[PDB]
Scaffold this active site. Structure first.
Site, mmCIF file in Angstrom:
data_model
loop_
_atom_site.group_PDB
_atom_site.id
_atom_site.type_symbol
_atom_site.label_atom_id
_atom_site.label_comp_id
_atom_site.label_asym_id
_atom_site.label_seq_id
_atom_site.Cartn_x
_atom_site.Cartn_y
_atom_site.Cartn_z
ATOM 1 N N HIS A 83 0.842 -1.190 0.000
ATOM 2 C CA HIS A 83 0.000 0.000 0.000
ATOM 3 C C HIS A 83 0.881 1.245 0.000
ATOM 4 C CE1 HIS A 83 -2.798 2.895 2.327
ATOM 5 N NE2 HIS A 83 -3.181 2.897 1.044
ATOM 6 N N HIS B 165 -1.732 1.212 8.261
ATOM 7 C CA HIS B 165 -3.127 1.321 7.838
ATOM 8 C C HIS B 165 -3.873 -0.008 7.810
ATOM 9 C CE1 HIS B 165 -0.675 4.511 5.979
ATOM 10 N NE2 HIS B 165 -1.658 5.334 6.354
#
Ligand SMILES: CCCCCCCCCCCCCCCCCC(=O)OC[C@H](COP(=O)([O-])OCC(O)COP(=O)([O-])OC[C@@H](COC(=O)CCCCCCCCCCCCCCCCC)OC(=O)CCCCCCCCCCCCCCCCC)OC(=O)CCCCCCCCCCCCCCCCC
Ligand SMILES: CCCCCCCCCCCCCCCCCC(=O)OC[C@H](COP(=O)([O-])OCC(O)COP(=O)([O-])OC[C@@H](COC(=O)CCCCCCCCCCCCCCCCC)OC(=O)CCCCCCCCCCCCCCCCC)OC(=O)CCCCCCCCCCCCCCCCC
Ligand SMILES: CCCCCCCCCCCCCCCCCC(=O)OC[C@H](COP(=O)([O-])OCC(O)COP(=O)([O-])OC[C@@H](COC(=O)CCCCCCCCCCCCCCCCC)OC(=O)CCCCCCCCCCCCCCCCC)OC(=O)CCCCCCCCCCCCCCCCC
Ligand SMILES: CC(C)=CCC/C(C)=C/CC/C(C)=C\CC/C(C)=C/CC/C(C)=C/CC/C(C)=C/CC/C(C)=C/CC/C(C)=C/CC/C(C)=C/CC1=C(C)C(=O)c2ccccc2C1=O
Ligand SMILES: CCCCCCCCCCCCCCCC(=O)O[C@H](COC(=O)CCCCCCC[C@@H](C)CCCCCCCCC)COP(=O)(O)O[C@H]1[C@H](O)[C@H](O)[C@@H](O)[C@@H](O)[C@@H]1O
Ligand code: HEM
Ligand code: HEM
Ligand SMILES: CCCCCCCCCCCCCCCC(=O)OC[C@H](C)OC(=O)CCCCCCCC[C@@H](C)CCCCCCCC
Ligand SMILES: CCCCCCCCCCCCCC(=O)O[C@H](COC(=O)CCCCCCCCCCC)COP(=O)(O)O
Ligand SMILES: CCCCCCCCCCCCCC(=O)O[C@H](COC(=O)CCCCCCCCCCC)COP(=O)(O)O
Ligand SMILES: CCCCCCCCCCCCC
Ligand code: FES
Lengths: 126, 102, 22, 534, 143
Positions: B29, B49
């Protein structure tokens, strides 16, 4: 008399004349439907679980139900019935306590016996 | 018991030793290290995250904002009995960018 | 959109390493 | 000696009329008209503690072996930036105190502007003619956030380094020119040489200069419009009722000024912030569980957490999922900057407003504000949802889904409740004007009817039932103590009863004083009426 | 409250008699379905349960001695006898809701066992109780 400023009556929102009052009904549905689109679009991630989808569908259903009864604005009518010892619309209620204090109206015609039973002798009234 | 229910990726069936699998530590990511390896659920969690990469599914994400699976490095043991890299990754590592695809 | 180039395994595998040199 | 210093300073700057004008400016007195000062004082503390902080700091990435005050971390290979930041807290006398003062001041600064912006928003102080102020201020808050971000990234510890890794990888994953732009900022792959140098030279110069310039312009522009004020007795849209600059405003400003300064000096000592010795040097492989950036940067990180894996693959090219995060944050900024324009498009009112308006009288804007506050708060909470999850025993997956769903249904509920409450407050305000203050004297009439004594604020017709006073845009009293019917009528100390002789005169004097005050206020009102009919 | 102060003697003497029966019957009777020995929960909390009724009863008894014949306590009273003022009732207040919120904060503080949360909740409760009492005392705003 109530005044309307920008489609919003001062009767419903007192200070309609002072500030931004009332969103048009079409903007409340645009937001609602955009939100429904987002809530349906949440189902397109990578999550393997199905608990979260149950919550998504439930909340979407609650949103859709809300946005429909906001759109069609369902209404009903007055029942217009009569229940035991209840009087129809357009009946004037005697002031019972006033009639009790001074012997008038409802308490306007008592038998001499009935006077003494409420502790007042008939000789005191003329 | 867990190594036997791994699903390999096409083109990297030979990237493991006996029971050893090597994945890039850099999150797909953003370049955060995904080092929260859960011993029983076999999920690797990114602290940043909250992406969960499967370890029994060639690093395929199963939660969070990560969309691409974790790159896997080929490994083997040399003659002396030390763990060595048998080759290189078959994809660019770390976060995605505009030009990264084939 | 769904997946770039990552696909599942071709066929299930098993082996014995038995890396020996006596 | 003093008569002669002024004489030969006026004889050459002709400044008698210029100074008299400045010292006679009137400023409205309201507690919410001071929240802007807090930002100013915190900014002064930042640039002053910051200069002291640069005499001991070396912003270099060059690796060294540490030998210094911190007996742990001796022998550990770290950057030059980390080693000097570690030296200004363990080798400089009172250097930890100043470092903590700096960070606390940064926090207060951002919260000093956010709350100020909320005051401006709710009361409608961004309306004509004050839109340059709104734009300037919005730029101020964004730059303040950016400044704070590059400030705590200077020590080059493990926690801050992950923030830079996140920021670099956000830039690099931008469509088309995110690769060239990333290489243009950092000067190469992350990390790079001349990466802590560009940030240090833009945090102690570029941003400060820009901020100072904007602030100075902001204040000068405020001094030109001579403030705004709430509707009240005797105050119209073409006057300012308050206090002069001297001797009252200037002293109050200094008094509050040093109060903020003193408060920051307390937290700097008694409360720990950014304990960088526990974090270790930046290493690309090591990470921690609580990697939240900072409170003002939490909303961006919270946006990145709740965005699903929505990548767009286009053959030889890919759009990362984080791109949508950037888009969303861009929309939030654009919505915030150009608010006066969107508010006046849908209201169709741009009429040079100088009188404020209470939040309760603008339910749509108030509700939008609380809707946006809930949005921001949910992003902020989602930004640190891993520390929420553990400390409050909630599933982390559940927290992610709360953030995702809550960003849609949280704002909606906030709007509904806030709107209804605004109208409720409006209604309560009309009951008093129509009927009077609800006194707590439940009398029983001879017939037996329990009646509450009502105190009219206006003339009555025949038998109570006050002539309804029209709404005036001001705060109506709601209790009888707000009219001074509970005022203590015993002068003296805690033990001292005080002589009656001196106690009679003082009550008489104060009585005559507030009579005269009320008389002058109502005369001002009357003046406005007969002025507005011509 | 002429009769109110009197009817509490009923429960008082009843519970006092049961408490003394309980103590003597539990420490001197072997049933076979239990053991022998005084029970220290039904004894203390039933002696002191009679204490509550006695306290309230005695207080109301002392109070009712030095009160005149009130119209509400008079059998043949006219409605016009109480014509006057019934003292001061609070019309409205936001503070009950606030202080319920404050006790909720302290509650969760104790649940999670977070020291900061307990401390904040305790002083968030003092503040709201203080504001409840000082509601009608807040002086007219002095400039
Ligand atoms: C106690 C006070 C002591 C003084 C120190 C305070 C420092 C700053 C003073 C602020 C208060 C004045 C505020 C104000 O706006 O009034 C202007 C006021 C005149 O007002 P005015 O009569 O209405 O004039 C009409 C216009 O403003 C005239 O406008 P204009 O068209 O002629 O253009 C003038 C414009 C200048 O032009 C522009 O920038 C306009 C842009 C043009 C673009 C095209 O601005 C000015 O008026 C310049 C005045 C200030 C000079 C700069 C500050 C000097 C302090 C630095 C010295 C200390 C080190 O000027 C002053 O008060 C003179 C300043 C005195 C400075 C003293 C120098 C230091 C000596 C100290 C020795 C101690 C022993
Ligand atoms: C720990 C607790 C510490 C909080 C203490 C804050 C101290 C603020 C200073 C203060 O009281 O100033 C005096 C101030 C009056 O000032 P003034 O000089 O006497 O009057 C000047 C004018 O008359 C103007 O006054 P006005 O008559 O127009 O009334 C002003 C009133 C406007 O009146 C309204 O219509 C209030 C309606 C908004 C509240 C509804 C909350 C919605 C809940 C969201 C649900 C999420 C699901 O306030 C506002 O403008 C609303 C702005 C802020 C709302 C943000 C609420 C937080 C939502 C975030 C949830 C997370 O008293 C207030 O009215 C308090 C409001 C100030 C902001 C506090 C936020 C409300 C608290 C609700 C959350 C519960 C806390 C837990
Ligand atoms: C369920 C729980 C219900 C809680 C909600 C009730 C809290 C109401 C806040 C009081 C402020 C409002 C007020 O003064 O009257 C209304 C006032 C209008 O009445 P007014 O005519 O101005 O007369 C009132 C006086 O002016 C006011 O008298 P004053 O002039 O003497 O007072 C000035 C100032 C006092 O001066 C100060 O500045 C005090 C500084 C604070 C000291 C703190 C010590 C520690 O007042 C305050 O700021 C007191 C606020 C403290 C409230 C603390 C209790 C909050 C509960 C804690 C829950 C925490 C939850 C954590 C969230 C978890 C999220 C996962 O303004 C508003 O309408 C503001 C509306 C606030 C929202 C209330 C609606 C809540 C609906 C939420 C849905 C659930
Ligand atoms: C005047 C005015 C602005 C008028 C509006 C008209 C107009 C033409 C508007 C532009 C169009 C529009 C509505 C939106 C543009 C949206 C786009 C494509 C924005 C991209 C801009 C861009 C290069 C953004 C940089 C990336 C950013 C801000 C990333 C955020 C971010 C940063 C910067 C961190 O440092 C960070 C650190 C630690 C954790 C997280 C983060 C984080 O998320
Ligand atoms: C200031 C007021 C604030 C009040 C906010 C309070 C609202 C919070 C509601 C919280 C609900 C939480 C229920 C928990 C649910 C949960 O844990 O499920 C999770 C997924 O969470 C979800 O989707 C639920 C998210 C949806 C919640 C919607 C929240 C919106 C709120 C903001 C609005 C409503 C309330 C408004 C109140 C405001 C007041 C004014 C009116 C996935 O389970 P998982 O972590 O994968 O673990 C399991 C394995 O362990 C195990 O093997 C098992 O086999 C697996 O199946 C798996 O379940
Ligand atoms: C750097 C932080 C800021 C500082 C130091 C600052 C300073 C000030 C000061 C000292 C005032 C004078 C009146 C008052 O105290 O209320 C003021 C007014 C004002 N500020 Fe700010 N401000 C800042 C941020 C902002 C922001 C972020 C906005 C808007 C988004 C803004 C918009 C305004 C407006 C509209 C006024 C006029 C209020 C009025 O005249 O009634 N300011 N500011
Ligand atoms: C404009 C407002 C400013 C903000 C919001 C701000 C914010 C910060 C923050 C949050 C830090 C991290 C401090 C820490 O590690 O505890 C920092 C560090 C620093 N700032 Fe600032 N700063 C500002 C202005 C300045 C100015 C004007 C200077 C220099 C003239 C300066 C010089 C420094 C230095 C040298 C550090 C050193 C890093 C350290 O010792 O931790 N700052 N700043
Ligand atoms: C007209 C209102 C329309 C509401 C949209 C709801 C659409 C959700 C469906 C997404 C999806 O399920 O397709 C996955 C696809 C394979 O991947 C993509 O391409 C992602 C599509 C890009 C969506 C970025 C949205 C950015 C959000 C913020 C800018 C808004 C905050 C305010
Ligand atoms: C510190 C915060 C202060 C700033 C407050 C923020 C205000 C800026 C926002 C401006 C709003 C404009 C409102 C308006 O004028 O109403 C209307 C604008 O049109 C809309 O309603 C836009 C619909 C968009 C819905 C978005 C859905 C969100 C989905 C969730 C995403 C995850 C017009 O009002 P009117 O027609 O006059 O009734
Ligand atoms: C405004 C938005 C803020 C953004 C926060 C995002 C939400 C996540 C919050 C996580 C909370 C963690 C709480 C916790 O774990 O508690 C503790 C850890 O953090 C803290 O100590 C919280 C300090 C917060 C300030 C309170 C100061 C009290 C003094 C008041 C004097 C005026 C652990 O419990 P303990 O300290 O041992 O009692
Ligand atoms: C009696 C004549 C000398 C005193 C006249 C006043 C001097 C000028 C004062 C100007 C003040 C500017 C700060
Ligand atoms: S960086 Fe690994 S999940 Fe965002």
């Amino acid at each position: 008399e109530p005044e309307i400023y920008r489609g919003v009556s001062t009767l419903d929102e007192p200070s309609a004349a002072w500030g931004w009052h009332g969103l048009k009904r079409n903007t409340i549905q645009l937001a609602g439907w955009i939100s429904v689109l987002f809530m349906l679009g949440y189902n397109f991630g990578n999550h393997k679980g199905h608990v979260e989808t149950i919550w998504l569908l439930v909340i979407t259903a609650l949103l859709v139900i809300g946005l429909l009864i906001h759109l069609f604005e369902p209404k009903l009518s007055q029942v217009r019935t009569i229940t035991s010892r209840n009087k129809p619309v357009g009946h004037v209620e005697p002031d019972w306590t006033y009639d009790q204090a001074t012997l008038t109206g409802t308490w306007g015609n008592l038998t001499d016996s009935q006077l003494r039973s409420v502790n007042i002798e008939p000789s005191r009234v003329a | 018991a867990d190594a036997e229910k791994v699903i390999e990726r096409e083109g990297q069936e030979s990237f493991h030793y006996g029971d050893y699998y090597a994945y890039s530590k850099i999150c797909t990511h953003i370049g955060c290290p995904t080092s929260l390896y859960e011993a029983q659920t076999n999920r690797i969690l990114c602290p940043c995250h909250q992406s969960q990469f499967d370890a029994l599914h060639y690093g395929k994400p199963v939660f969070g904002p990560a969309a691409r699976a974790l790159p896997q490095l080929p490994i083997t043991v040399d003659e002396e009995g030390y763990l060595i890299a048998a080759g290189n990754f078959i994809e660019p590592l770390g976060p995605a960018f505009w030009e990264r695809k084939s | 959109c769904x997946x770039x180039x990552x696909x599942x395994x071709x066929x299930x595998x098993x082996x014995x390493x038995x890396x020996x040199x006596x | 000696s003093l008569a002669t210093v002024g004489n030969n300073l006026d004889s050459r700057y002709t400044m008698a009329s210029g100074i008299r004008r400045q010292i006679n400016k009137v400023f409205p007195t309201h507690w919410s008209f001071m929240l802007g000062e807090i930002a100013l004082y915190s900014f002064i503390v930042l640039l002053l503690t910051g200069v002291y902080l640069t005499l001991f700091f070396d912003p270099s990435i060059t690796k060294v072996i540490y030998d210094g005050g911190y007996l742990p971390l001796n022998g550990v290979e770290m950057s030059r930036a980390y080693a000097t930041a570690l030296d200004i807290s363990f080798e400089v006398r009172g250097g930890l105190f100043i470092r903590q003062m700096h960070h606390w001041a940064a926090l207060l600064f951002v919260v000093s502007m956010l709350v100020h912006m909320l005051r401006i928003f709710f009361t409608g102080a961004f309306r004509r003619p004050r839109e340059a102020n709104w734009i300037i201020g919005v730029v101020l808050i964004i730059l303040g956030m950016a400044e704070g971000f590059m400030g705590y990234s200077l020590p080059d510890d493990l926690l801050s380094g992950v923030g830079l890794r996140i920021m670099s990888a956000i830039i690099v994953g931008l469509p088309i020119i995110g690769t060239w732009m990333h290489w243009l900022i950092f000067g190469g792959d992350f990390p790079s040489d001349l990466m802590l140098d560009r940030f240090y030279i833009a945090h102690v110069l570029i941003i400060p200069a820009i901020l100072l310039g904007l602030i100075a312009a902001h204040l000068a522009l405020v001094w030109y419009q001579k403030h705004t004020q709430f509707p009240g007795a005797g105050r119209t849209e073409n006057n300012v009722i308050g206090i002069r600059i001297m001797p009252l405003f200037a002293v109050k400003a200094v008094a509050f000024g040093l109060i903020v300064f003193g408060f920051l000096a307390l937290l700097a000592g008694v409360t720990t912030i950014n304990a960088i010795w526990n974090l270790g040097p930046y290493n690309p492989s090591q990470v921690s569980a609580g990697s939240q950036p900072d409170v003002y940067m939490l909303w961006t990180d919270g946006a990145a957490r709740v965005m699903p894996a929505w990548e767009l693959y286009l053959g030889n090219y890919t759009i990362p999922a984080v791109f949508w995060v950037a888009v969303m944050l861009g929309i939030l900024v654009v919505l915030l900057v150009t608010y006066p324009f969107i508010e006046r498009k849908f209201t169709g009112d741009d009429a040079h407003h100088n009188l404020l308006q209470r939040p309760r009288d603008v339910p749509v804007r108030t509700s939008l504000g609380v809707m946006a506050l809930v949005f921001y708060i949910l992003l902020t909470v989602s930004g640190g949802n891993d520390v929420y999850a553990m400390q409050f025993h909630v599933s982390l997956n559940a927290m992610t889904w709360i953030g995702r769903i809550g960003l849609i249904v949280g704002p909606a509920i906030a709007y509904f409740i806030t709107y209804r409450l605004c109208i409720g407050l409006q209604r309560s305000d009309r009951e008093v004007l129509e009927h009077g203050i609800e006194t707590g004297i439940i009398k029983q009439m001879p017939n037996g009817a329990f009646i509450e004594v009502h105190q009219p604020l206006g003339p009555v017709d025949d038998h109570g039932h006050p002539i309804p006073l029209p709404y005036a845009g001001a705060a109506v009293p709601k209790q009888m103590n707000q009219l001074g019917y509970a005022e203590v009528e015993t002068r003296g100390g805690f033990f001292g009863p005080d002589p009656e002789d001196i106690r009679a005169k003082a009550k008489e004097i104060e009585h005559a004083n507030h009579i005269e005050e009320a008389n002058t206020l109502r005369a001002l009102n009357e003046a406005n009426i007969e002025r507005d009919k011509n | 409250m002429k009769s109110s102060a009197k009817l509490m003697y009923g429960p008082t003497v009843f519970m006092a008699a049961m408490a003394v029966i309980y103590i003597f019957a539990t420490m001197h009777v072997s049933d076979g379905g239990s053991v022998k020995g005084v029970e220290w929960v039904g004894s203390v909390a039933l002696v002191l349960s009679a204490g509550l009724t006695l306290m309230l009863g005695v207080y109301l008894h002392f109070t009712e001695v030095r009160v005149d014949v009130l119209p509400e306590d008079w059998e043949e009273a006219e409605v016009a006898d109480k014509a006057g003022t019934l003292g001061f009732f609070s019309p409205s207040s936001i503070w009950p809701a606030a202080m319920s919120g404050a006790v909720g904060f302290l509650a969760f503080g104790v649940v999670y066992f977070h020291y900061w949360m307990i401390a904040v909740g305790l002083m968030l409760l003092i503040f709201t109780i203080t504001k409840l009492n000082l509601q009608y005392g807040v002086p007219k705003e002095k400039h």
